[PDB]
Structures are given as C-alpha cells and as structure tokens.
C-alpha cells in the first residue's frame, strides 16, 4: 500500500507547490529595492571576556542584557558580568562536551547540554553559595543541539534524535515529543509568544511547532545543504535560517515561501549561529570565515563585518534590549560588540 | 577608582574564579584527548578493554601520559555532525573490522562491511576539520583474518585484488588499500598495527603514536617544521 500513499502524497506536494507559486505576487527583492540601506555598520570589540580556557560553543543572554552564560569544552559554563567582565559564576559541567546553553528569563536557572544526551538545569539562586545542578533531565536518544527556557518549569530541547521535546522541569519528563524531521535538528529559537518554536533540521528544512497541541503547523523546504542555525524575527511572524550552504534564508509564516536569501559569490564557508537585532533589520550570523557578516533582513545586501576572531564564530547572541552582540567563538574568547556613534 | 566595596569584592570573586579555572587547566593540560572511531560492527568495543547511549569516557594513563579516550558509537547518527566537538584531539583511533570481508551489512546486504569502513575512513581521513589530526588504524580481528584468509579471498569486495591469499600478503594489501585514502601524507599520519583480542601491545603503540604527534605539534608551533 506504499505506492498509492506515495502517489497521493506527491499529489498534495504538487498542490502545495502550486499554492506556493500562486501566493508569490511579488518577490521581496522588488519591495526592498526602494528602501534606504543602513550603510557600512562597524562595531568594535568593547570587551573580550577572556578566561574560557577551551573551545566555546554556546552563549546566551540574560533578560537584563547583563549576564552571559558561555559553555566550552573545559567542562565550564561561565556566567560573566557583561558590563564589568567579572565572572559571576563558574559552573563545573559534568560532561565536558557541550553544544548548547540557555538562561532562564527569571535568571534563576541556566540550561546546559551537549553530546551527553542530557540537559542539566542549574539553579543559580541557592541558599548555599554554590550553583547546584537542579535537574539532570534525560530521555533523548541523540545529542542535544539547542536548549531554550519557557517559564522556568518547561524547557524546549532539540536533539539529534530527529526530535524536539518540551520537558517539564519539576516532573522531569518530556511532555511533548515533536517528531517529523527527517534529519537531526541543530537549531532552536523559541518565539517571543512562547507558544511556537522553529526547528532547523539537517534535513535541509525548518519547521514551526506549536508547543501545546504538538503537531507541526508549517514546514519549510530550503537550503540544499543542512540547516545549522536559527533565530526568530521579533514580530513572531518570521524566522531566519543559515546552513553549510552559505545562504541566510528568511521565511515568514503566513507566506511559507522563502521570503529572502542573503548570499554573495565570495561566500562559501558554512554558518554556525544566526541571530537578530531588536528591530529585525540585522541578521548577524557567524560564518566559517572567522567573522560575523551582518545581513539586512530586507535589502539583502551585506552591511558590515564583525571580524576579530581566529576561529569559528560558534555562538552569536544578541542583547534583549538590542544593545550588544556577543560572538562566542572557537577562539576561546567571548567578545561583546556594540555599535558606536 | 569609582569601584565600591561591592564591586571590589566582586572583582576579588572574579579573580578567585579565574584562579579556579586555571587550577582546573593545570590538570586538564596534562591529559591528551583521543577519539575512538570506526564502524560499530566490531573492533571499537574491544580496544577499550585492551586499554587497561551517551558519550563514553575512558581515562587511562601510560607513563605520565593521561589519555582521555572517547567512545561515541552510541551517538546513533549516521550523518557525522557532532564531529566538530572533537576537532582538537590529537589522535583519531580508527578501528577497521578487517576480518569481516566475507560479511556484509545485515540491513541492505548488497552493502559490504569493508566498503562501509572504507567510506568511513575516507570521510574521516579527509574531513574538513580532521585535516592534520593524525589517525591510528587498528586493523582488528587479525587472528580471524589469519584464520579465514585462505578460505575466502578479498576478490568479493575488492574488484582489483590480485596476488596471493596468504595472511602476510593480504594483510599488507588491505593495509595499503586503507592508507590509499590519505590525500596528504605530510599534515597527518595513518599509523598501522594489526591487533587481535590477546594483543597486549596496543597500548604501547597508541602511546608511541600520540608521543610522535605531540612532538610533531611541538615542532610545528616552534616553527622548525
């Protein structure tokens, strides 16, 4: 019975492709051919938060845009005071191999996960002065790639198990297991609405998932190669994906077609982290060229570079108020970049 | 100044934290990191026993050299993407299920175990990160290879195999075949030492290889290369 199902499925793919072609009354290039380009945007290294003795993979920003969680292979998750470079905390990870880190919005907890197939939730605010691993929640059969908090009781974790799970911290079990991605997911950006989130799988595709009902609402077929980074546009109606195919594709949900593609001829190297500024006019993304070519979300022309690292830019975070961008690279040096005047 | 008692003690705490990090680095730097790779068909899980799911650590020491081996076969991901975590190791210890030439994959039996191993060593010996990260081949099951070599030749998997089906000749032929995937023979090395279950000299070989690699990187950073 496989053949008939495959044929009918091909029929619906043809129908949805016809819908995709029909909805595209005008490409975004035409709309943005008349906008005022920002211009040469240059940001200097305000601080190199040195002290992380190994390869940095993940960073995240607290909700006051003052505390940084940087995770590396020295088994260390360091919480840095961004304005003063002071090291607020030095969490001794249990498994030195790490891929993702997160900061609870209330600032009480930090998420940390990697090739251990577990996510460790550490409680920063304790009566004793040490940070204790509040919950070692496991169950994924596959490595973890991104962790994002929702309400200090549910955490969304994307795994190499071709799945993304919504874990209840207090109970310690996975409430919903979003499944359907062909390849493993290396990206997760919870929406500001805290109801949906996008998974960047290596199936060369992205997917929306609403967190309550559990099924994917929209699937986006994009890059030829595998998707390695994600972010959510601040409005919550769009998101942006980067890949080894050195293309940054911005999709919007109400129009499933790939809204825009940013890529130049000289760009070959892959992308590792993609983020957004508050206005959504920038897509600072960390490539393999040891830099952070920023791209305008609309005019699709490069606006600046944030070079200054001697290795991959692994994690590219942005302040919650849009005041600075952090470029935690494999260079073992977290760097804060703030535009001048 | 413009630094209160609060901020001053915060800086003292930062200095204490940095000192703890560097004290941890004291122990960390003395240990060298090896990645145990190879098809999970066999060979990978026996050299760990010879060295005396989640990421398996293997802390073993030899003559003041503290090796951290990492077993990864439980990761369960066909496409190799976590590999960039280990970029920075000094030895990719690849195990070749050499004896399995008469055996094919249980799933899709048209695919041979040896050809899968060759594709793996081609992907990892010429990976875009494991450029100069040297590789130690352990051609496992050398006892079974010696026993079976007269029974089944290599013609089944190797269309171009020719010569004598003797153990000493066929083993060298397959060793050369595996080393043929070395695009460059100067940035990295493919060491070779066929191993068996009772071979107690494997730890010696891995120590010697990692010693050579560490002296190699020391020469390179010193600019004498």
């Amino acid at each position, epitope marked *: 019975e496989l053949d008939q199902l495959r044929q009918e499925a091909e029929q619906l793919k043809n129908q949805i492709r016809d819908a995709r072609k029909a909805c595209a009354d005008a490409t975004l290039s035409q709309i943005t051919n008349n906008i005022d380009p920002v211009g040469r945007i240059q940001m200097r290294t305000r601080r190199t938060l040195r002290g992380h003795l190994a390869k940095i993979y993940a960073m995240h920003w607290g909700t006051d845009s003052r*505390l940084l969680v940087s995770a590396s292979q020295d088994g260390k998750l360091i919480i840095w005071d961004s304005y*003063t470079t002071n090291k607020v905390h030095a969490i001794p990870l249990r498994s030195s191999w790490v891929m993702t880190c997160a900061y609870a919005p209330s600032g009480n907890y930090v998420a940390c996960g990697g090739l251990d197939n577990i996510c460790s939730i550490y409680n920063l605010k304790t009566r*004793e*002065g040490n940070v204790r691993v509040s919950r070692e929640l496991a169950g994924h059969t596959g490595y973890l790639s991104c962790c994002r908090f929702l309400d200090d009781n549910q955490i969304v974790t994307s795994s190499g198990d071709t799945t993304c799970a919504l874990w209840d911290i207090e109970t310690g079990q996975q409430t919903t297991t979003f499944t359907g991605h062909t390849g493993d997911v290396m990206s997760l950006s919870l929406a500001p609405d805290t109801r949906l989130f996008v998974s960047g799988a290596c199936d060369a595709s992205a997917k929306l998932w609403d967190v309550r009902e559990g099924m994917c609402r929209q699937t986006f077929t994009g890059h030829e190669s595998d998707i390695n980074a994600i972010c959510f546009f601040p409005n919550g109606n769009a998101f942006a994906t980067g890949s080894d195919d050195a293309t940054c594709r911005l999709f919007d949900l109400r129009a499933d077609q790939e809204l825009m593609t940013y890529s130049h001829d000289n760009i070959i190297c892959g992308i590792t982290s993609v983020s957004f500024s508050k206005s959504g006019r920038l897509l600072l993304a960390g490539y393999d060229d040891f830099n952070c070519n920023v791209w305008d979300a609309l005019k699709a022309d490069r606006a600046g570079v944030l070079a200054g690292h001697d290795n991959r830019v692994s994690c590219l975070g942005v302040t919650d108020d849009g005041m600075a961008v952090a470029t935690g690279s494999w260079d073992s040096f977290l760097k804060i970049w703030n535009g001048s005047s | 100044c*413009t630094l*209160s008692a609060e901020d001053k003690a915060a800086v*003292e*705490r930062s200095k*204490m934290i940095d000192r703890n990090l560097r004290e941890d680095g004291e122990k960390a730097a003395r240990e060298v990191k090896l990645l145990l790779l190879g098809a999970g068909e066999s060979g990978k899980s026996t050299i760990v026993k010879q060295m005396k799911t989640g990421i398996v650590e293997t802390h073993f020491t030899f003559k003041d050299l503290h090796f951290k081996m990492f077993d990864v076969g439980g990761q369960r991901s066909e496409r190799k993407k976590w590999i960039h975590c280990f970029e920075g190791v000094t030895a990719i210890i690849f195990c070749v299920a050499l004896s399995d030439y008469d055996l094919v994959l249980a799933e899709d039996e048209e695919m041979n175990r040896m050809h899968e191993s060759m594709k793996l060593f081609d992907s990892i010996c010429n990976n875009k990160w494991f450029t100069d990260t040297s590789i130690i081949l352990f051609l496992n099951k050398k006892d079974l290879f010696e026993e079976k070599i007269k029974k089944s030749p290599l013609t089944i998997c190797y269309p171009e195999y020719a010569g004598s089906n003797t153990y000493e000749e066929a083993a060298a032929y397959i060793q050369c075949q595996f080393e043929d995937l070395n695009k460059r023979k100067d940035t990295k090395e493919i060491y070779t030492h066929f191993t068996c279950a009772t071979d107690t000299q494997n730890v010696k070989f891995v120590f010697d290889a990692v010693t050579d690699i560490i002296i190699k990187e020391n020469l390179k950073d010193c600019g004498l290369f």
Partner: single-chain antibody, 232 residues
Framework: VQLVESGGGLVQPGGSRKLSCSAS????????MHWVRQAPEKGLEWVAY????????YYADTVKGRFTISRDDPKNTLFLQMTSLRSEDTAMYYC??????????????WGQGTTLTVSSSDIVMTQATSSVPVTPGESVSISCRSS???????????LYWFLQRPGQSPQLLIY???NLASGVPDRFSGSGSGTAFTLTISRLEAEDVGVYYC?????????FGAGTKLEL
C-alpha cells in the same frame, strides 16, 4: 544553614580570647565573612571583614590592631583572636556571612552569636525616631539618615536593612534598599532619596516586632544606625 559561634563568657580586663565560628550548610570558601558587635544594650557595630581566601581583611578603627580575624576554610571555621580587651568591648558578637557578585545579597545569614563580659570620618547613620508605637495591620515607614549620598555611579545605592527580633539574631530585610531578601514577606520594602531613606512596612504582626537597623556599605568603615525599637 547554621552559624553557631563560641567563646564569650567572663574575661578579666586586659585579657584575651579567641572566638570560633562554626559554619554548616553552605559553601564557606566562597563566602566572605564579617563580624558585628552588639553592646549589652546598645546598637550594632561592625568589627572586621575577611573576603573569600582572606585577600582583603578590614577592621574598625576602634578595634584596629588589637583584634585579628582569620578563616580556616577547610574546617569551615571563623577565628577571631581578642588581644588586650577593655570596657569598650563587653558586647554580643555576631558572625555574619556575605557574598559578593552581581545580584548577590550580602549579610544574608546572621549567626546566633556569643556574648562576652569584661569586668571593671566614617558615614553617619542616624535613626532619629528610635521608638515608634505600632498596631498590627498598620503601615509604618522608618527613615534612616546618611551623612552623604549612598549612591554610586554604578546605579546602586548601598543601604541595607535588618530586623532584630527581640532576643534573636538580625534578619536581612532589604539589600541595596530595593531588593527584598529570600524568605521575607512581600510587605517589607524600601526607597530613599539618595541621602535619606525609608523602609516601609505594610503590616506589622507579632513576628515583625523588634528593632530595625540601617547600614551603609560604600566604604569599609561599615556603620550601623541606632535603629528603632518597636512598641505595640
């Protein structure tokens, strides 16, 4: 968490002693530690502070040299050698823990304390009222007055409030006079105009009876206010 101290008792004038402070239930090595002096019926006074690892050791000018303060980290103990005592030192010493990072709550836990009886420039923190009649359910605000503005260029003003329950160790109420402590009812609050400050209380049950004290922390000569006694 427990911070029971030892020593105390009777001391002949001109003598010596050594307070031992036992710490349990928390990571001592990451906690700076201060001593606070409580004369038999007077207010509190800061004695000496040692940071984590004893990098910085500060004393009060009224006690400099005569006293020495150290911390045995592996045994989680706080030692205070008392050389050349005098009538000014018959008091009720308390052993306070403090941690110092962004968002920390210094002077969080206070110990039970031990009393010693001996036989026969800095910021001024003044509490003018020192006696206020209260009834449960009423909202009462206590103003403590500082010699200078306690506000740093870093955006924080460093005023602490403590409640001394009758016959009990001081309990943190608000740190940086804007951050409520942990385990304290939400009725307590604080706000101040840079150099004069008011701690506000929405309701005053029997648990809230006691003496309130204000504290500066910009400069290491930490100075306690006279506080206010609570009358029902």
């Amino acid at each position: 968490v427990q911070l029971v101290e030892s020593g105390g008792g009777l001391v002949q004038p001109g003598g010596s002693r050594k307070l031992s402070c036992s710490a349990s239930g928390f990571a001592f090595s990451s906690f700076g530690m201060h001593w606070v002096r409580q004369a038999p019926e007077k207010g509190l006074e800061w004695v000496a502070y040692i940071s984590s690892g004893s990098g910085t050791i500060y004393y009060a000018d009224t006690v400099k040299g005569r006293f020495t303060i150290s911390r045995d980290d592996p045994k989680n103990t706080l030692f205070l050698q008392m050389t050349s005592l005098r009538s000014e030192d018959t008091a009720m010493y308390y052993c306070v823990r403090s941690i110092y990072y962004y968002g920390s709550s210094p002077f969080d836990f206070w110990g039970q304390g031990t009393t010693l009886t001996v036989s026969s420039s800095d910021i001024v923190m003044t509490q003018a009222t020192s006696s206020v009649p209260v009834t449960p359910g009423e909202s009462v605000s206590i103003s403590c007055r500082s010699s200078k503005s306690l506000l740093h260029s870093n955006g924080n003003t460093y005023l602490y409030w403590f409640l001394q329950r009758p016959g009990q160790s001081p309990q943190l109420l608000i740190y940086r006079m804007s951050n409520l402590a942990s385990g304290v009812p939400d009725r307590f609050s604080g706000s101040g105009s840079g150099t004069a400050f008011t701690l506000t209380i929405s309701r005053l049950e029997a648990e809230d009876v006691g003496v309130y004290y204000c504290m500066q922390h910009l400069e290491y000569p930490l100075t306690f206010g006279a506080g206010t006694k609570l009358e029902l």
